[PDB]
Design a protein around this ligand. Structure first.
Ligand SMILES: CC(C)(COP(=O)(O)OP(=O)(O)OC[C@H]1O[C@@H](n2cnc3c(N)ncnc32)[C@H](O)[C@@H]1OP(=O)(O)O)[C@@H](O)C(=O)NCCC(=O)NCCS
Ligand SMILES: CCCCCCCCCC(=O)OC[C@H]1O[C@@H](O)[C@H](N)[C@@H](O)[C@@H]1O
Length: 323
């Protein structure tokens, strides 16, 4: 097939042409793309903590090379475009565009199929790096979380966080207890670890946070000794000191943010760039009228109160030294 035919068949926008040309030049992977089917597929999806409802649907809608040629063309090359950067954190996180939902369940679940097809490759990388199996699997389970998030946010099955799963699939991100850590470099090339907080796994309890921090240096110095990070960096709505107006002393965020050293400037009060982030992570915001969002928790009430008052939330950036 040709990239223009794929683009038109799948209903992809004109801007995606450059990507599709790049995928055309890259070509199919050396190891043919294989999707698990049936109970094999159900076992893998369950291992990745995909909810039963979605997993059933994913298995049912799995595409076919003959009946879904445009989709298959893209699945092979997207897989290839990811595995070509296995272990490479300097490459940008390009998972490809979401597919228009007029293509049905196979289109909605496209990047789940990408993920499934790429599991063997990343698991081989984990093995080569000596990563324990439990850590490898624990890391890959965010697929289930992101699938669940799609359904909560939009109302039907899907997974549209494919840019983020390129981290898991390149073996450059590891879940080490409550927190995740990514191989990263600053603008000056200095190695660090990106610190991330997946939604699943309960509250950000101080003892769980501390355990994760203690795991970071030993893990990376053992399996990626060439990296040599000494510091973890975080960028998050969580680091916004404005939260102190609203959250009390029992807040995990408040207690733990106190250990962080913020490195960005106090943002302009009129800068609204951070509003969408906090709305995503607190409400999985999808354009609802604000006073029709839940108000059960102190943070839910905080986000809305602050915004109603004409004020703005900001992503802040900081670091903590690795123990
Ligand atoms: C990170 C996370 C686990 C922290 O939860 P936590 O440890 O309970 O945080 P706190 O102790 O500071 O919470 C204070 C209050 O806000 C509530 N709260 C915390 N995070 C919340 C969220 N994402 N949505 C709604 N309410 C939340 C708590 O239940 C608590 O309520 P209460 O005071 O009414 O009892 C949670 O916010 C989460 O799952 N977020 C999604 C993932 C995320 O944001 N990661 C970072 C992306 S940059
Ligand atoms: C106060 C506790 C520590 C504060 C440091 C918080 C750093 C968290 C940063 C983080 O979680 O961001 C990474 C996110 O990348 C998103 O885009 C993905 N959707 C999300 O999964 C991931 O959490």
């Amino acid at each position: 097939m040709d990239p223009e035919t794929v683009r038109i068949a799948l209903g992809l926008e004109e801007r995606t042409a450059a990507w599709l040309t790049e995928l055309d030049e890259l070509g199919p992977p050396a190891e043919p793309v294989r999707l698990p089917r049936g109970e094999e597929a159900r076992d893998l999806l369950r291992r990745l903590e995909v909810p039963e409802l979605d997993a059933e649907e994913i298995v049912a809608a799995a595409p076919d090379p003959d009946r879904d040629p445009a989709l298959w063309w893209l699945l092979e090359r997207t897989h290839h475009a990811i595995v070509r950067h296995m272990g490479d954190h300097r490459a940008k996180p390009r998972g490809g565009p979401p597919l228009p939902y007029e293509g049905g369940a196979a289109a909605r679940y496209f990047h789940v199929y990408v993920f499934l097809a790429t599991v063997p490759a990343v698991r081989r990388f984990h093995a080569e790096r000596g990563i324990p199996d439990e850590v490898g699997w624990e890391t890959l389970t965010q697929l289930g979380e992101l699938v669940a998030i799609h359904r909560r946010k939009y109302g039907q099955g899907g997974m549209n966080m494919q840019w983020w799963t390129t981290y898991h699939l390149r073996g450059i991100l590891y879940r080490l207890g409550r927190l995740q850590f990514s191989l990263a470099t600053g603008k000056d090339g200095t190695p660090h670890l990106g610190l991330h907080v997946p939604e699943w796994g309960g509250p950000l309890l101080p003892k769980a946070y501390d355990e994760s921090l203690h795991r970071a240096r030993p893990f990376f110095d053992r399996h990626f000794p060439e990296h040599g990070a000494r510091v973890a960096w975080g960028s998050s709505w969580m680091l916004d000191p404005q939260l102190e107006e609203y959250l009390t002393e029992d807040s995990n965020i408040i207690q733990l943010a106190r250990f962080w050293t913020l490195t960005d400037s106090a943002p302009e009060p009129g800068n609204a760039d951070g509003d969408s982030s906090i709305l995503e992570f607190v409400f999985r915001y999808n354009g609802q009228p604000l006073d029709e969002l839940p108000q059960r928790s102190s943070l839910e009430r905080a986000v809305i109160a602050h915004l109603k008052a004409g004020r703005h939330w900001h992503m802040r950036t900081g670091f903590v030294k690795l123990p």
